[PDB]
Design a binder for these strands. Structure first.
Length: 14
RNA sequence: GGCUCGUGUAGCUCAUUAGCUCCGAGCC
Protein backbone atom coordinates (compact mmCIF):
# COMPACT_ATOMS: atom_id res chain seq x y z
CA UNK A 1 0.00 0.00 0.00
CA UNK A 2 2.36 2.98 -1.16
CA UNK A 3 2.74 6.74 -0.27
CA UNK A 4 1.95 8.63 -3.64
CA UNK A 5 2.88 12.19 -2.59
CA UNK A 6 4.89 13.00 0.63
CA UNK A 7 3.00 16.30 1.64
CA UNK A 8 3.00 19.80 -0.03
CA UNK A 9 3.98 18.29 -3.50
CA UNK A 10 6.72 15.59 -3.01
CA UNK A 11 6.80 12.14 -4.93
CA UNK A 12 7.59 8.52 -3.77
CA UNK A 13 5.96 4.98 -4.11
CA UNK A 14 6.39 2.79 -0.89
C1' G B 1 15.40 31.20 -2.93
C1' G B 2 13.36 27.62 -6.26
C1' C B 3 13.35 22.55 -8.62
C1' U B 4 14.07 17.39 -7.90
C1' C B 5 15.11 13.21 -4.98
C1' G B 6 15.46 10.16 0.46
C1' U B 7 12.17 5.47 3.89
C1' G B 8 13.93 8.52 7.52
C1' U B 9 13.44 1.81 12.67
C1' A B 10 8.91 8.78 11.07
C1' G B 11 3.31 10.12 11.22
C1' C B 12 -2.45 10.11 9.00
C1' U B 13 -6.93 7.14 6.16
C1' C B 14 -9.69 3.39 2.99
C1' A B 15 -7.91 -3.29 1.72
C1' U B 16 -5.17 -1.51 -1.49
C1' U B 17 -2.63 0.35 -6.89
C1' A B 18 -3.11 7.49 -4.64
C1' G B 19 -3.40 11.61 -1.67
C1' C B 20 -2.39 14.26 2.78
C1' U B 21 2.01 16.17 7.51
C1' C B 22 6.96 17.58 8.60
C1' C B 23 12.01 17.52 7.96
C1' G B 24 17.15 16.32 5.70
C1' A B 25 20.56 16.39 1.33
C1' G B 26 22.23 17.39 -3.64
C1' C B 27 21.97 20.48 -8.02
C1' C B 28 21.00 25.08 -10.75
Amino acid sequence: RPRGTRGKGRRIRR
